[PDB]
Amino acid sequence: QYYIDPTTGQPRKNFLLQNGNDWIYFDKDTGAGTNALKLQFDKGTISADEQYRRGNEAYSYDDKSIENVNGYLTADTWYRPKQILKDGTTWTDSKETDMRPILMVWWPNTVTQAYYLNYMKQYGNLLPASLPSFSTDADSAELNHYSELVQQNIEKRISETGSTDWLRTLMHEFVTKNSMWNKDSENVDYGGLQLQGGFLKYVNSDLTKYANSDWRLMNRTATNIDGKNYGGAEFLLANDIDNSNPVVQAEELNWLYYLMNFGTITGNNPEANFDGIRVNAVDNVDVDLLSIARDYFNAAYNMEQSDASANKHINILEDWGWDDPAYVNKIGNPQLTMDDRLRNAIMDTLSGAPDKNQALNKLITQSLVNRANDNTENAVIPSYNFVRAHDSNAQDQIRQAIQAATGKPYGEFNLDDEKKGMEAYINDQNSTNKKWNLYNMPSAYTILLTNKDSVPRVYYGDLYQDGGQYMEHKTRYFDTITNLLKTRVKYVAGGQTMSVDKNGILTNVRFGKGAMNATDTGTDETRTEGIGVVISNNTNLKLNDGESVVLHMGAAHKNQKYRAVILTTEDGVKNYTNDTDAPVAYTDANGDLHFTNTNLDGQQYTAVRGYANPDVTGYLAVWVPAGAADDQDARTAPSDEAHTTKTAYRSNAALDSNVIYEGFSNFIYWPTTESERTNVRIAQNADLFKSWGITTFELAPQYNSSKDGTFLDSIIDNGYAFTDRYDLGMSTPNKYGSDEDLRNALQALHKAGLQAIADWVPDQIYNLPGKEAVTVTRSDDHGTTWEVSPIKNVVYITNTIGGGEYQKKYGGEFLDTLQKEYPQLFSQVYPVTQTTIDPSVKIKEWSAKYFNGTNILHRGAGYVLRSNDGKYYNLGTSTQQFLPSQLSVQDNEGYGFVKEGNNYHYYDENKQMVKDAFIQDSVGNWYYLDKNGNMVANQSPVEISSSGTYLFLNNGTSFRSGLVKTDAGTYYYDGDGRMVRNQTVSDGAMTYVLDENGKLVSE
């Protein structure tokens, strides 16, 4: 049972020997001999091709074997194959860390497969440099050959590097290049409020049931309560919060309570709580929110009782739509509407360039109040007004100045870029001709601060330079505007008149406290109160001789000395903070002040005419009575009389005694030292703000920025874009300081007697880290389906799960207290939902079920993998378990080597019988199927073309690299199974000389 050679002591291995009628084969490994006539085809044998197909099957359908989201696969999915073709030669069982790209073995179509090949060659160096680009009409057997080559080379590089880090990077660079897996398939569009280039709304589906909702009532603003009109746009930025969901409404009330009790809750400090709210982005959320805030303020503070109790919680709305005020009035003015009619009237008549400004009459009429003869109180809708804001006429223009100074694209910049752009912006601000800055700021502010029936709001960026550390550098307007502000406290009260004469000159008059009309003789205090204002927008203004401008100061101001507050000059303006050296004018017996093209009593700049300089383009002059005492205070304290009417705020002299300060810019820089922190510095200046007549300080939103860079808010970290609703400089400082600095700022403000406003931002949330498969439809900013988009009821990977430790710590936690203390809040039916808030479920973590949708994320229409027929692949979690065919376990009945009669056939991948071909098995042997499809296994010399002489043992294996000793001589078959003739050969140590018939001569 061994055949050794007795002379050389060597055994013969892989040797077939004839012993009479007996045939003995001595095997490869040990030379162990066995009856050659009894060798049988191993019926468990598989082909080399079959092993390749099986190695690439998924190890399993568990979460760890196949990277997924809710069971769905993505173009980025890596998986654990059953076997790894290690170093591109040896099939080896996979470990659980042997994850591989699904795109190494599967493609959505053969076009993509071909692009994959060209990309892996050109960018991965995974195929020979000089190989033709693969074509659209590329053969599928050619594509498959070279896909296997790529596999082999990938495993080769993985072996030299011991890593797939390079491969994660390369595959995602490749993915990113396909239209179906990038923004090209998302219909990028910036129309309306698609500030980030597009929206996807969340829709109910059986495929993604955990993200379904009974609510998602969209666009339901003050003009669209029932849902039958268009309303404002529901969609704005980032992840849009579904505020029509009763459970979400309860969570907004929870958060509102937190802000109003922030100092108690976070530091046991009753002096560190906010006093009011700014409702941010009102026209972008369910208007039910205005009613929920009202009801809570009514239960906690008794807002509607009297002016005294209401005015102790000044609240304002960011409500841009022109039909909003009537609505705000209808529901009790729980928060002040803005007067956008009036702000626009200022933009149109003062704030434009000399050749853009319109006649000044509109300042009198285009407003919630007609100011021709404003001589009553409690008769109009109460409002706040303003000239600029952190966004309005600041953020766009500043980004223009940044782009112009640096050359970078719009809205992209680093801190050096901001600074250079700020330099350019401030130079523009200080020119006569302005490109990025508003004109006539002195006049605009004079209108702002002398209007009756208005709570004016002063903007930080008009007192201090927008870019820089908090309060670092003053604007050119600081003296002018603060002069106006202290003058407002001291003199501005009572009735108002406005008219525009024949020369287009506006005269604006306040009578002082105790007089509503020009005919009222007023009280004691009236005498040295009131104000007279002359404005023109005509840089070329010239009055003709004799012509004049009359201010009708009134019957309380007959034969009286007035002195200048502000005069226009050639290069600017002159400010006078009191009576010293201020030019004078005298009223006549009628109380009329007269100006002409001539100076009064030889005093320079007391004549009326046009100027054009960095402050004034047109004309500004402001006059008050002389000889007011230095402590004169013209304000009116709110009455604690019971309200006859269901409202909170009333438009009167007490409300008119309030000034809001918007105390930030988007462009405040990050502090370089703790003393530079906005909120520390706010704490140091509360008396300064009080001196200006500021009664409420509007703080920036204090939520920690997402810092994700997906919008201006998360570039300069203003606080409008955040992940965690309850993290107010707590996890780490916000741009303005720690939560400690915040509390100290609030406590210091309260010490001065100032209120403080929390910016309430219930529209949206940014940068949630947890992925979620959601059925989405591409849509405009109202959620109207984008008709040309193929993204329609399509599963899509969203970033919708998370919210921070503070949302987790506090979400829903005060709902108990609220039920206990104010049960009345939980019984109110709100107008859009027509049911109550729902406190029975606490939100401690966000997921898609609580969102109306998201900006487009640039993952691509096809990112979530589906078969040709539209069926989604899935592990089995969210829908039917269905995996690609190359990952799936295949039925092998009829495939591979099948016995039929006394023959073995081989049926290929298409179940095709193979004829006249060699097939290699997974362990290295070759087999030949003859022209009839029949495995040869007869142990006889046979001629085969592709001619050579082959011999196949009874188990069908091609005999090869060995000797055959028959009674008629010995033959040698080479490494390819072909008989050798007529040469000397060497196989290892053995040398074999063969003649022309193949017979062995010597060895």
Ligand SMILES: OC[C@H]1O[C@@](CO)(O[C@H]2O[C@H](CO)[C@@H](O)[C@H](O)[C@H]2O)[C@@H](O)[C@@H]1O
């Ligand atoms: O900022 C873009 C755009 O948003 C509006 C919406 O009213 O501004 C308010 O809401 C945004 C998201 O909360 C903030 O970016 C913005 O600062 C805030 O005032 C529009 O005013 C502004 O044009």
Ligand SMILES: OC[C@H]1O[C@@](CO)(O[C@H]2O[C@H](CO)[C@@H](O)[C@H](O)[C@H]2O)[C@@H](O)[C@@H]1O
């Ligand atoms: O808001 C109306 C406005 O949206 C536009 C472009 O911003 O169209 C989008 O919204 C449509 C509503 O019918 C989709 O059907 C459409 O595919 C998409 O362009 C404007 O056409 C339309 O005036």
Ligand SMILES: [Ca+2]
């Ligand atoms: Ca919204």
